[PDB]
Amino acid sequence: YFQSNATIELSIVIPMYNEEDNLEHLFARLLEVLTPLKITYEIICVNDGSKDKTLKQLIDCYQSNRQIKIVNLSRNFGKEIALSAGIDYAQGNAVIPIDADLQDPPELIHELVDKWREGYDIVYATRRSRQTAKMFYKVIGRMTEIKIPPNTGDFRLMDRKVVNAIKQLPERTRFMKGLFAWVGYRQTFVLFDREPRWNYWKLWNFALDGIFSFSLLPLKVWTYLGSIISLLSLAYASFLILKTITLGVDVPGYASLMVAILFLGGVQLISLGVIGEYLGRVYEEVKARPLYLVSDLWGLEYLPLEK
Amino acid sequence: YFQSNATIELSIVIPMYNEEDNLEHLFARLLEVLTPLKITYEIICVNDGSKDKTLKQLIDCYQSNRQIKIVNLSRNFGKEIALSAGIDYAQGNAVIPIDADLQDPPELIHELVDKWREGYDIVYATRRSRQTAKMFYKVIGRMTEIKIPPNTGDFRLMDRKVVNAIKQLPERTRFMKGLFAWVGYRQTFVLFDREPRWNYWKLWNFALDGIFSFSLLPLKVWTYLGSIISLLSLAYASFLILKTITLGVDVPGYASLMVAILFLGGVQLISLGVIGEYLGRVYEEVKARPLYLVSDLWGLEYLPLEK
Amino acid sequence: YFQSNATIELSIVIPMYNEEDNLEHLFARLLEVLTPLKITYEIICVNDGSKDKTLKQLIDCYQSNRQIKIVNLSRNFGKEIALSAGIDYAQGNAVIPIDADLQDPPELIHELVDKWREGYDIVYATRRSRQTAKMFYKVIGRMTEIKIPPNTGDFRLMDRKVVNAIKQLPERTRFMKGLFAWVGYRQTFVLFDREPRWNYWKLWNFALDGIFSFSLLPLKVWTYLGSIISLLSLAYASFLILKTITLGVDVPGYASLMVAILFLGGVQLISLGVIGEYLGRVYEEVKARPLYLVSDLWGLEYLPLEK
Amino acid sequence: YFQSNATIELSIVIPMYNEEDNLEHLFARLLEVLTPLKITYEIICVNDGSKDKTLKQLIDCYQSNRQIKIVNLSRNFGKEIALSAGIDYAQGNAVIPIDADLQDPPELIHELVDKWREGYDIVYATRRSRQTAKMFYKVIGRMTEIKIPPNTGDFRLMDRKVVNAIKQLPERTRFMKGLFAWVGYRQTFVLFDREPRWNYWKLWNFALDGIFSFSLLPLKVWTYLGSIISLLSLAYASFLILKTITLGVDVPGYASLMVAILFLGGVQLISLGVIGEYLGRVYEEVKARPLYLVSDLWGLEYLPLEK
Amino acid sequence: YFQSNATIELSIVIPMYNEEDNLEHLFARLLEVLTPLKITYEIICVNDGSKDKTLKQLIDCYQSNRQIKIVNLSRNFGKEIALSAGIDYAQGNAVIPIDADLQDPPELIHELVDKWREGYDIVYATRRSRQTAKMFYKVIGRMTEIKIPPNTGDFRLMDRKVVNAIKQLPERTRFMKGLFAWVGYRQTFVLFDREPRWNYWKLWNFALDGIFSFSLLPLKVWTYLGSIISLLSLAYASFLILKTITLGVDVPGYASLMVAILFLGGVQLISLGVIGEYLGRVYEEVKARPLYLVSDLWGLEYLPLEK
Amino acid sequence: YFQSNATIELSIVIPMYNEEDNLEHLFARLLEVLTPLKITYEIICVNDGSKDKTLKQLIDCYQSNRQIKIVNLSRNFGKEIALSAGIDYAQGNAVIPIDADLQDPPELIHELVDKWREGYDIVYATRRSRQTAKMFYKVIGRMTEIKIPPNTGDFRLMDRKVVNAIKQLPERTRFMKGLFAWVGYRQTFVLFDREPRWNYWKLWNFALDGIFSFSLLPLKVWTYLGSIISLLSLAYASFLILKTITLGVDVPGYASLMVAILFLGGVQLISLGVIGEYLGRVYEEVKARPLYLVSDLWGLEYLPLEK
Structure with a gap:
């Protein structure tokens, strides 16, 4: 009773x-x-x-x-x-x-709980068209199918599974700038209107944070690009030092200054590239975010993942 | 029964x-x-x-x-x-x-299990000559006797010992790009032919990843090389600033510009070298891969190595 | 008895x-x-x-x-x-x-214990005017209301709560250079005079240490500033390489040398900016200092936070 | 019995x-x-x-x-x-x-055990004069009173206290290149002669490794030195851009090239300095070597220091 | 290898x-x-x-x-x-x-190990007819199908399962007097002859120990038998005290003495019966031997059964 | 130092x-x-x-x-x-x-410590002849070779092994009344004289306590003795009830009274015997004193024996 x-x-x-x-x-x-x-x-x-x-x-x-x-x-x-x-x-x-x-x-909250009972792990409350190639750019940059509108909601429901997944992650504080697109659980939204009623800088800062928070691609690409630029500059410097010895010395101080500038630029670019490679490896070592997330298990028990 | x-x-x-x-x-x-x-x-x-x-x-x-x-x-x-x-x-x-x-x-799988029963910890299934100084270059770069053909197999058997050794390592996901040559257990292969039937870029990318994943040698060597280059450039700059004061000033703006360029290049190269040295030490600090691996013990019990 | x-x-x-x-x-x-x-x-x-x-x-x-x-x-x-x-x-x-x-x-110690009994978690013993815009500069740099005089005391009382909060932090050894302003508990001071009786370098070194120990703002701001400077230099280099082809070549070796210098400076500045961004993220990953501190709980039990 | x-x-x-x-x-x-x-x-x-x-x-x-x-x-x-x-x-x-x-x-081993019984925690077996300002340089660089001869012994005894102190340290493998001078326990040596019978490079490499393994002083000093050099170069560049506008333009392309070179060198030196400062802080964060070591306790029990 | x-x-x-x-x-x-x-x-x-x-x-x-x-x-x-x-x-x-x-x-031992490999948990080495209704009496008293000859072997093999089952039991020391018949695992024997070559007292003492070690039946049966005997004696005493009052008093001191003897015998027999019942319950409470034993599990994990 | x-x-x-x-x-x-x-x-x-x-x-x-x-x-x-x-x-x-x-x-204490250093686990301080068949009776009742004089010392040394053996035993409080003879370690004594200077009741009470504290023999022997006495009495009662029916009834009330007394005595003696047997088994179940004690181990580690 x-x-x-x-x-x-x-x-x-x-x-x-x-x-x-x-x-x-x-x-x-x-x-x-x-x-x-x-x-x-x-x-x-x-x-x-x-x-x-x-x-x-x-x-x-x-x-x-x-x-x-x-x-x-x-x-x-x-x-x-x-x-x-x-x-x-x-x-x-x-x-x-x-x-x-x-x-x-x-x-x-009634609608959020209703959608949660249907099996969704994250439900968002998104304003109904609050007062375009960028949307497509953001979608193709998210590299994971997300259909929630751009404002995408800070008023939301999150399942115990999701909150346990991200409880040790520095990006838990800023969940809505790209971690929501990385967790990739079953997600939906609920539309609503607000009686009291569009920054582009904000709509670009979150993408800028996401492209560096969940990918080492900029670092790797720029290291290789700087490496090939350094190689080309060093090749040009070797060509120029081959020049002016077989050919004339019309320019007194231009050739030696260029070869010095090119050689120094190349050696510093190689140093920056090696430093960037090892910094990237250090980042992969100290990263707290895991390699995968498990939604369900059949015939198995969850691994501890904590101590 | x-x-x-x-x-x-x-x-x-x-x-x-x-x-x-x-x-x-x-x-x-x-x-x-x-x-x-x-x-x-x-x-x-x-x-x-x-x-x-x-x-x-x-x-x-x-x-x-x-x-x-x-x-x-x-x-x-x-x-x-x-x-x-x-x-x-x-x-x-x-x-x-x-x-x-x-x-x-x-x-x-029958052949893999047969070879496993004979005492091998890792058995590879390698294609029988699937459709050269590079092989020698790779062998001498591996600095550990490995005889498995270059394709070296993603279909393989791994003993519980090996999977426990590498279970906390970021390079577990890419086991076959150099971690297999680092673990160094008892390893063999099995040859087979595939009825349905050679990229050089792939055969070089794995070596490029291995030379940076399991050695700090490139970083140390380049830091010392840049240091000696910086010292030579600074010595030349000191010689040039000694010059043009005792000797003539035929070049009005060439000498001062060179000394400025050389001094700046030297100071930045020294900064890059010190940063690289400390980054290398940071990498040794945060590395997850252990210092050694133990195959067997006689008269001793295995250390926990976990908590 | x-x-x-x-x-x-x-x-x-x-x-x-x-x-x-x-x-x-x-x-x-x-x-x-x-x-x-x-x-x-x-x-x-x-x-x-x-x-x-x-x-x-x-x-x-x-x-x-x-x-x-x-x-x-x-x-x-x-x-x-x-x-x-x-x-x-x-x-x-x-x-x-x-x-x-x-x-x-x-x-x-009697006064310190008396103030501790009133509910203060940190009590300082500050000299009574030991033998100004800097004070205002320090206050606005502290970004947290602290009223203790600048000498601010090494003779102090600290509650078990505070000593447990900072027991795993590298800055525990230097508590009084900015960690006291970060913990932000209930704090007071006690004034006293010393019978035996002003360095500006010391009064600036603690601020210099604090602005880097508790904020990534200098790193982020300088990375973005160097990025915009690099973009402007690369734009000027592109303008100059557009120049001298449509226009005259009055300067034989000046234009090519400038474009080379500007391009190299821009590429190295972009490399430094990317390296700085990833180093900042690495710093956020390995930081020991927590995200928040809890003073009291009602209806809840403290989380372990240790193992 | x-x-x-x-x-x-x-x-x-x-x-x-x-x-x-x-x-x-x-x-x-x-x-x-x-x-x-x-x-x-x-x-x-x-x-x-x-x-x-x-x-x-x-x-x-x-x-x-x-x-x-x-x-x-x-x-x-x-x-x-x-x-x-x-x-x-x-x-x-x-x-x-x-x-x-x-x-x-x-x-x-008899002599080592005899000296160990007298209360010494580390005993070295040093060759008796195996076949000078450097010794003084090494002593003043060790910043801790060590009297053991330079060869200083790889054949040694170490107490359980010392081996427990350094069991989690990367420098345990190379104990004799500066970690012995950092642990600072009670240490002695035993002299002996070897019937079968001086590299300067080796005698300098250990000092070079020690000055970077146990001190951030080179990094800090070089960051501040590069910072002041960058400030002086930027001041000279500002002076030169003030020049040639009030004064003559005798040099057509020398002044603009110098101001560009100086400004770029200064901005890159500031970037390198900030990166070095934050890298140093990262190193202090991930360091495994502790802040102090305890020899004995009276009235207290040892802290766990492990989990 | x-x-x-x-x-x-x-x-x-x-x-x-x-x-x-x-x-x-x-x-x-x-x-x-x-x-x-x-x-x-x-x-x-x-x-x-x-x-x-x-x-x-x-x-x-x-x-x-x-x-x-x-x-x-x-x-x-x-x-x-x-x-x-x-x-x-x-x-x-x-x-x-x-x-x-x-x-x-x-x-x-070779034969014992051979039989153990076939799936038997207990193997006995029984003498081959070492130098009858009793065998049938023992078999019917064992209330569990055991076919091993009466000598039944002290030289035996026992599986880890059996030794873990009985490791906390007082009757482990005397395993062969009835605990072997209680464990009831898969059991067999091996016959052999001894070159150097029948007590009835021993062959009855083990049965006497078994009938009390693994059954409370004697206690319960005797308590109920004594209870009914006491009831009959008390009924006879009540009949006798009804007698000699309605009938004659021919025997002066015989009737009163009998009624006293019968009443005392009945009250003491009831006391003994109640004490026996509660002693039996106490025995069931403090017994170490468990209620059942588990041979195998499918789809389940063994319960701890220890702390 | x-x-x-x-x-x-x-x-x-x-x-x-x-x-x-x-x-x-x-x-x-x-x-x-x-x-x-x-x-x-x-x-x-x-x-x-x-x-x-x-x-x-x-x-x-x-x-x-x-x-x-x-x-x-x-x-x-x-x-x-x-x-x-x-x-x-x-x-x-x-x-x-x-x-x-x-x-x-x-x-x-000096002598006790001296004897302890020689390998004895229990050393007694016994008075040197403080102011006979009983000694032999006690020795043969001790069923374990003990040579210490009868007073046998309350001033003694006990090794950590012995105190850990008996730390959970009720007889620890009275160690010297028979538990010392049960532990059976390596034991000796030291003789001394007391300047200030024989109860038989005390010398018998300890034996009386020992014969019941470390043996169930009195209970078993008396149960079997009472059982055979009960059987003989019941046989005599059956003989007497066979008598007086075939033979004369010279004694009117003697024969019936004897048969009643004998039958009641027999049934109560059987009840007492069964109760004693089950009480003995209960005692073996709840006993805290272990089955054996281990002095040393070679190649093995001590079992926990505690939780």
């Missing part, structure tokens, strides 16, 4: 910073949405060095609500780091990061 | 990708070869994001066969990464990677 | 080096201050390769005093390394590093 | 390579020296890919002698790596590496 | 007591039989407080033979306890207890 | 009870004897609910002496239990229980 279950079905993570007189309304809306779901849940609240009296009312809420937990950080780190800390302390089958001002309606 | 053994004698690893209507024939041939061996075996099947319905028939085969196990990857990684995942999940005294299209006859 | 407690309330750490005939007076003053506090304490004495007979009298003191412990180092490392070793071996709720010559009065 | 002790007092480590018909005499001399010592001992024999039949007679000796143990390596690594493997597998209070040809008399 | 295996195939256990000048011949015969088997083996020698110099020659044999191990007991316990200690210290797939005087030929 | 050893060579255990003003003299004599031994030692002081101020001066002594440790018991248990607690908390290669009044001279 009355039974106790110790497993959490859903974790809501809210990083807070000077959210003083908004805690009541926020929790009112959260419980007005969450209790019709009839699932077990927890709310992880992360305080990152607030200067008003947010923490005292957080503790007051914690006393009268068993589903509220508080993570207090030593100082004011970023909001992304606060989200990372909350997700690190969250236990639950699905994790949903929630923004404290509720710009995105909390009623989308 | 009926006894149960929980140890696997042999692991077959087959990475699959869009192998939809070929699973039946593949398993038919595999069991037609494996059951005369009268040994315990498992078949590890790795699916790397197939787009057809390979996984459903894999599960259908898994239901009616106790020797079939499935590894499902989160997305489509490489076939080499799929092989690495399968070998990581394989438990058995010998591991044999098998290609799903059976271009190499499965009847070679 | 007589009960035993196994927990230490306070650890005093004194690195010693040739402190031969001063041990008696030092311990006399230490016990004359510590016993009115009515708390449990230990004194950790670190010998770093003293050449006089400091260790024999240390052992003599250890025999007749249960609160004295000795750490003997293999050779003479630095005094900062001796302090690090002592703090590593100290068990206690608060740790106070004490200088062996007692230049700072031991009676400040 | 007859009691069993499971602790080894002394480990003898002999790396063997094609030591076929010398095993009998070697063991005869070893037991003729060791049994008068009346201590428990083991002999660790390391085979590194011998091509003659050394291993079969090693096993024959192992069958009839309980004090003989064999380490078989997968292939022929170096003799120094074989010594490292043997020391890794050696259990005993003291470890003595012994050369298989017995060029150094085994009767020196 | 030369490989090391750390697993023992067979353990020979010889308890020794004053076996001084027989060790050579014993080991000669043992190795003359064991080495044709081409299997790995160990010989566990148990000394139980010998008074001659057996242990010194045991140690002499141990020095020159890697397959000899010695267990020294604190004093002279029984020979059965010495066998138990040896089996406790034996590691091997099969264990064979061997008598030190070799009354049973060691050539039977 | 100064080295620290963390191993104790000798533990002195002194149970104290109202030893107020004797602590100084006791420790004076103890250190006057112990320091010439030049070995590491500890003194374990056990307070068992003293009513005077023994504990405060114990703590005062503990503050100024590193070799003094205190065990405080919750209340006043026995002095033997205090000795057991002290030995439980003692760490050292040898343990010596010392009486607080020093009736036995502490100078005997």
